[PDB]
Amino acid sequence: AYTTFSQTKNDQLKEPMFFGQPVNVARYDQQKYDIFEKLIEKQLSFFWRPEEVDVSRDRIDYQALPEHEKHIFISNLKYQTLLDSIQGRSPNVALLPLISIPELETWVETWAFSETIHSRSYTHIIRNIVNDPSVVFDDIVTNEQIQKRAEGISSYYDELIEMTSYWHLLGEGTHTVNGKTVTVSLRELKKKLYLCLMSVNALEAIRFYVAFACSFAFAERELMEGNAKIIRLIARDEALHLTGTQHMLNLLRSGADDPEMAEIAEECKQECYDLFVQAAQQEKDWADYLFRDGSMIGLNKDILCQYVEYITNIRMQAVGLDLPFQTRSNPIPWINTWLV
Amino acid sequence: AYTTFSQTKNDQLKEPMFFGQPVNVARYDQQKYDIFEKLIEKQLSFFWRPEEVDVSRDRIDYQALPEHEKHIFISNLKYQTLLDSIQGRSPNVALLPLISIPELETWVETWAFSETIHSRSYTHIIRNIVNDPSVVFDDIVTNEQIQKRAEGISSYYDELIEMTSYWHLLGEGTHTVNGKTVTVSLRELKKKLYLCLMSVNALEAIRFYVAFACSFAFAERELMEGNAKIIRLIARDEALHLTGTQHMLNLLRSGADDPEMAEIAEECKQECYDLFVQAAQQEKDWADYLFRDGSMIGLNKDILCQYVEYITNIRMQAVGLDLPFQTRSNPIPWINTWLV
Numbered sequence: 076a077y078t079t080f081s082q083t084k085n086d087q088l089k090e091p092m093f094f095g096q097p098v099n100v101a102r103y104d105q106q107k108y109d110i111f112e113k114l115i116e117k118q119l120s121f122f123w124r125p126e127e128v129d130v131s132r133d134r135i136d137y138q139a140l141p142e143h144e145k146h147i148f149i150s151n152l153k154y155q156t157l158l159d160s161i162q163g164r165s166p167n168v169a170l171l172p173l174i175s176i177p178e179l180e181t182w183v184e185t186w187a188f189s190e191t192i193h194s195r196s197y198t199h200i201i202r203n204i205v206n207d208p209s210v211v212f213d214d215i216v217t218n219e220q221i222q223k224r225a226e227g228i229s230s231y232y233d234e235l236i237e238m239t240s241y242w243h244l245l246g247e248g249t250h251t252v253n254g255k256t257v258t259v260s261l262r263e264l265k266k267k268l269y270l271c272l273m274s275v276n277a278l279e280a281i282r283f284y285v286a287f288a289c290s291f292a293f294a295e296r297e298l299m300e301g302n303a304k305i306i307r308l309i310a311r312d313e314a315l316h317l318t319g320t321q322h323m324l325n326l327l328r329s330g331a332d333d334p335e336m337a338e339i340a341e342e343c344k345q346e347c348y349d350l351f352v353q354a355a356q357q358e359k360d361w362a363d364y365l366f367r368d369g370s371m372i373g374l375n376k377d378i379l380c381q382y383v384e385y386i387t388n389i390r391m392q393a394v395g396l397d398l399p400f401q402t403r404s405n406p407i408p409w410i411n412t413w414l415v
Numbered sequence: 416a417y418t419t420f421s422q423t424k425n426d427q428l429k430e431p432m433f434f435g436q437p438v439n440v441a442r443y444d445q446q447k448y449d450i451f452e453k454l455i456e457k458q459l460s461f462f463w464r465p466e467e468v469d470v471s472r473d474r475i476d477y478q479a480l481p482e483h484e485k486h487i488f489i490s491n492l493k494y495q496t497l498l499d500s501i502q503g504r505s506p507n508v509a510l511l512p513l514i515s516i517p518e519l520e521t522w523v524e525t526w527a528f529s530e531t532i533h534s535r536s537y538t539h540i541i542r543n544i545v546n547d548p549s550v551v552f553d554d555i556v557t558n559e560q561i562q563k564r565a566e567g568i569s570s571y572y573d574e575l576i577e578m579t580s581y582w583h584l585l586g587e588g589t590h591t592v593n594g595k596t597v598t599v600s601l602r603e604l605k606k607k608l609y610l611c612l613m614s615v616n617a618l619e620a621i622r623f624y625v626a627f628a629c630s631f632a633f634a635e636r637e638l639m640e641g642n643a644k645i646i647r648l649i650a651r652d653e654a655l656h657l658t659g660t661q662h663m664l665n666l667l668r669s670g671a672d673d674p675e676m677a678e679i680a681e682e683c684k685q686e687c688y689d690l691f692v693q694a695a696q697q698e699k700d701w702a703d704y705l706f707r708d709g710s711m712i713g714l715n716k717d718i719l720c721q722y723v724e725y726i727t728n729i730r731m732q733a734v735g736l737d738l739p740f741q742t743r744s745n746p747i748p749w750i751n752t753w754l755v
């Protein structure tokens with residue numbers, strides 16, 4: 076059963092990252108994995124407030140944009156809002172109840188908080204460019220293409236949370252709930268956590284990239300420069316997040332943490348592969364919806380597509396997976412000046 | 416029946432603060448209660464890092480304190496570490512799954528985040544004054560004197576968490592679970608939230624204050640000044656947190672947010688009064704503890720206790736509870752030079 080302050084005096088240095096005794100004393104004088112303490116310090120050094128980025132000229136530039144280019148900017152904004160909305164609460168609600176080491180507990184919390192800063196920045200941009208934000212915010216949940224092309228995300232979290240609840244209440248075994256047989260197994264829960272983690276990783280590694288590239292393309296035609304400065308900050312935060320999920324996944328893979336997680340990573344390898352491939356496809360589909368009731372001059376659905384492939388391969392290899400796409404060179408190296 | 420992104424387009428202004436549809440889109444262009452957005456704003460403007468306050472000279476001051484003064488300083492730090500260890504994690508684990516308005520959702524992740532900074536600050540202090548932090552950190556979990564408070568506080572959050580889990584897993588009704596009858600009633604669930612929210616108010620309202628007082632007592636004496644600087648940053652954050660729980664409680668009690676909550680607030684009165692008083696008495700016994708070995712210069716058990724009584728009456732009144740102690744002027748006006 077979960078407790079906010081476990082009463083057993085435990086050596087936190089020997090607990091696994093997940094499924095061990097809930098964290099009791101939050102101390103930062105020692106760590107099982109210093110990478111997490113490093114990441115917290117770095118995120119705290121990058122603290123920024125949106126409020127401090129002038130975006131007044133952007134309302135002018137935006138007003139002057141062709142409808143087709145406006146739809147691209149708005150749509151991306153709507154998409155980033157969906158993601159960061161989910162990224163703000165999810166790590167806290169889904170992982171926090173499973174963490175067993177303090178450095179990771181605090182990291183998750185610092186990471187989810189920085190996502191809320193991102194959310195706030197969208198509000199800042201939006202209310203500075205459109206005379207009524209509700210048009211944008213109200214077409215999110217309903218936008219059939221955002222929900223369609225971003226199908227699967229709440230899914231991994233939602234099932235994990237439900238499973239976690241059953242396990243925290245009932246414990247392992249086969250039970251009878253309202254006449255129904257329900258089986259609770261930790262190994263299964265670990266698979267659910269592992270794949271959730273691999274999906275967050277995909278989200279962090281690839282999902283923002285086509286948005287960033289659009290935003291940045293605008294900045295290269297010398298337009299939407301305040302937005303661009305914000306996206307620059309956001310991207311720098313996402314790089315830390317990703318570095319943090321890659322490490323978690325890789326440490327889990329090495330078998331140096333919980334040994335059962337090393338068997339699970341291996342047996343799930345094919346699903347890891349498929350979800351990444353599914354995500355790439357989703358981004359590619361997004362690429363069309365954007366390059367729809369028109370397009371752009373400097374970029375197009377094919378260029379986007381090449382880039383999504385370019386990036387997905389880099390990212391999959393970082394986590395030890397096989398490459399699904401043909402190897403190519405970055406198709407828009409100009410993005411590199413704005414990145415990380 | 417909890418999701419990280421509800422698919423129903425809903426009017427977020429019309430939703431209650433808790434137990435409504437889970438929050439989908441995080442937008443901050445509008446709010447049902449401006450207070451929570453204001454709170455997020457101040458807390459961000461107050462951002463600070465413990466690392467930038469120099470604690471080095473505090474080493475010689477602590478080393479030179481009389482032994483029983485070292486016990487007071489340390490026990491206090493231990494107690495503060497306990498409270499903030501619970502406060503970094505809890506609000507997120509306990510409230511997030513029940514919030515239905517975005518501003519509240521965000522404020523709760525910002526609030527909890529600022530508390531991780533407080534715990535980080537206690538390691539910074541501890542690290543800089545003793546040689547082995549493990550001596551401090553390993554005597555909190557099982558230290559008898561601290562322990563009682565921990566159990567009392569955790570309890571409220573824990574029962575709330577468990578009932579929330581059954582609620583979201585099975586919904587209301589009389590259910591069977593392995594031969595056992597289990598009744599789930601939202602009325603009762605509301606009752607448990609009100610009470611845990613009441614105990615956190617007492618926690619922010621009064622339990623930290625007595626620790627502050629002792630910290631500030633040394634500062635008045637020109638001792639342990641780095642610590643005193645950090646504690647001043649901490650008490651400034653605490654004032655905002657309390658402002659939050661006070662507002663939440665008052666909104667609930669007035670029936671303005673959820674009519675049923677006004678009924679629950681009245682049914683619950685005596686017990687809220689009993690809990691605040693119980694909290695106050697622990698602080699007193701805690702003071703009697705601290706000063707068993709003799710007063711520190713400038714502060715003593717009796718004054719402290721008068722101080723608890725004085726602050727309690729204030730806090731209580733603020734949340735419409737009867738005053739349990741005889742009215743008095745603040746017995747240690749000098750604390751105001753350090754608080755706000």
Ligand SMILES: [Fe+3]
Nearest residue numbers: 159162190193
């Ligand atoms: Fe983000």
Ligand SMILES: [Fe+3]
Nearest residue numbers: 162279313316
């Ligand atoms: Fe992120």
Ligand SMILES: [Fe+3]
Nearest residue numbers: 499502530533
């Ligand atoms: Fe605090």
Ligand SMILES: [Fe+3]
Nearest residue numbers: 530619653656
């Ligand atoms: Fe606090």
Ligand SMILES: [Hg+2]
Nearest residue numbers: 169271272275
């Ligand atoms: Hg996850």
Ligand SMILES: [Hg+2]
Nearest residue numbers: 231232271274
């Ligand atoms: Hg996930």
Ligand SMILES: [Hg+2]
Nearest residue numbers: 266342343346
């Ligand atoms: Hg699997």
Ligand SMILES: [Hg+2]
Nearest residue numbers: 340343344347
């Ligand atoms: Hg894998």
Ligand SMILES: [Hg+2]
Nearest residue numbers: 571572611614
């Ligand atoms: Hg509580």
Ligand SMILES: [Hg+2]
Nearest residue numbers: 509611612615
């Ligand atoms: Hg609470």
Ligand SMILES: [Hg+2]
Nearest residue numbers: 487629630632
């Ligand atoms: Hg003291």
Ligand SMILES: [Hg+2]
Nearest residue numbers: 683684686687
């Ligand atoms: Hg009550």
